[PDB]
Amino acid sequence: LMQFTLPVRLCKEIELFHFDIGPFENMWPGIFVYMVHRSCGTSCFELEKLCRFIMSVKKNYRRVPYHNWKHAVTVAHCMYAILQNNHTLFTDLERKGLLIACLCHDLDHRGFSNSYLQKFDHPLAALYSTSTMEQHHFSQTVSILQLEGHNIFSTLSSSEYEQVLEIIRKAIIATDLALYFGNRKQLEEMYQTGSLNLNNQSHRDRVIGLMMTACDLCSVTKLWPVTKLTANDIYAEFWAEGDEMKKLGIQPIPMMDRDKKDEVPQGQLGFYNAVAIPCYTTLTQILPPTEPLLKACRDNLSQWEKVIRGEETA
Ligand SMILES: Cn1nc(-c2ccccn2)cc1NC(=O)c1nc(C2CC2)ccc1Nc1cncnc1
Ligand SMILES: [Mg+2]
Ligand SMILES: [Zn+2]
Fold first, then answer.
1. N or C: which end of the chain has fewer CB within 10 A?
2. Residue 74 CA: which ligand is closest?
3. 160: how many CB neighbours lie within 10 A of its CB?
4. CA-CA distance, 88 to 90, in Å (whole number)?
5. 84, 41 in Cβ contact below 8 A?
6. Sign of the C-alpha dihedral, residues 149, 150, 155, 159?
7. Residues having C-beta closer than 5 Å to ion ligand 2
8. Do residues 104 and 216 lie in contact, with contact meaning Cβ atoms separated by under 8 Å?
9. Which residues approach ligand 1 with their CB closer than 6 A?
């Protein structure tokens, strides 16, 4: 066989939840295949269809500041770490589908929210009236699968193929944060009451959804310098959106207004308390070995407090 291998530093550190995939774009396909060979197995996908599918996916990500090809691989790496430290809980189809869902989850993102598409009257908002962007990301995933030499799920049965596409579809839709609030409430109650059942498909669906939120936000779970530099990239997109809102003659919400640059630390504080902490808390409860995502979220929360109190710069 041919195994994929990484330099010694990468081979060890890719196992830590807080691994940063680095600034060399040409290493990222290599890193993703390695993660698939170790979580799934070297037999899950024909290497030549994978390589062709990966490079077609890369080509349909845009060069936007945050929702880009580096984000896709970073989210997949977080899923890799959740999957490797909970290896007894997931099926063969789920390992296969969820890494792929993560790589494809923001395909053809232009840096604008579902709200902007609705106010702009983008054609996609008439096609898909809710989770607009997320339904487009899936649709693009399907397009690429249906290119010649690109069906990585060729070896699967007719009914398996349909299950793995349903796993991918729900996983991608679950990255609509407007759906996370509801999904986290439900999982919290089910966990506190004792009803949560990993053999119930609609319960599996909710947990995978929560893993997808955790993976999608995992930028708040990195070493402080990575988390701080990554917040520049997200605000660059938010502020460009708020400018386009103002051009429609609409006041953007505060997080998208570049005039409120100085309230960024206070907004981060808001985001960690209302969203990130709850998220990593509930995921730790359901999946104890994902502890370090919560620990590292709390540490960066503590860092943002330092920034507000003038004991840190940004
Ligand atoms: C709710 N909210 N309010 C403010 C705010 C409010 C007022 C003033 C200034 N900012 C900012 C935000 N959201 C995020 O910061 C944020 N959102 C999202 C998902 C799109 C939702 C993902 C990540 C986020 N952060 C982040 C990402 N990657 C590294 N580090 C941090
Ligand atoms: Mg998205
Ligand atoms: Zn994303």
1. N
2. 3
3. 14
4. 6
5. no
6. negative
7. 106, 175
8. no
9. 177, 217, 219-220, 227, 230-231, 234, 254-255, 260, 263-264, 267-268, 270-271
Lookup result for tokens 């902007």: 116
Q: Tell me how the structure was determined.
A: X-ray
d(CA 23, CA 46): 28
Place of tokens 């839709």: 173
* Amino acid, single-letter form, for residue 20: D
Token pair of 218, please? 């995992």
Which domains are delineated in the chain? 27-309 (1.10.1300.10)
* Conformational region of residue 41, where left means phi above 0, alpha means psi within -120 to 50, and beta covers everything else: left
Please say whether the dihedral angle defined by the alpha carbons of residues 286, 290, 292 and 296, taken in this order, is positive or negative: negative
What lies within 8 Å, CB to CB, of 153 at 6+ separation is 96, 145, 160, 161, 164, 165
Placement of tokens 């890369």 in the chain: 58
3-state secondary structure the chain: CCCCCCCHHHHHHCCCCCCCCCCCHHHHHHHHHHHHHHHCCCCCCCHHHHHHHHHHHHHCCCCCCCCCHHHHHHHHHHHHHHHHCCCCCCCHHHHHHHHHHHHHCCCCCCCCCHHHHHHHCCCHHHHCCCCHHHHHHHHHHHHHHCCCCCCCCCCCCHHHHHHHHHHHHHHHHCCCHHHHHHHHHHHHHHHHHCCCCCCCHHHHHHHHHHHHHHHHCHHHHCCHHHHHHHHHHHHHHHHHHHHHHHHCCCCCCHHHCHHHHHHHHHHHHHHHHHHHHHHHHHHHHHCHHHHHHHHHHHHHHHHHHHHHCCCCCC
Amino acid letter for position 7 = P
Q: Is the distance from CB of 151 to CB of 49 less than 8 angstroms?
A: yes
Q: What is the amino acid identity at position 18?
A: H
Q: 268 among the known binding-site residues? A: yes
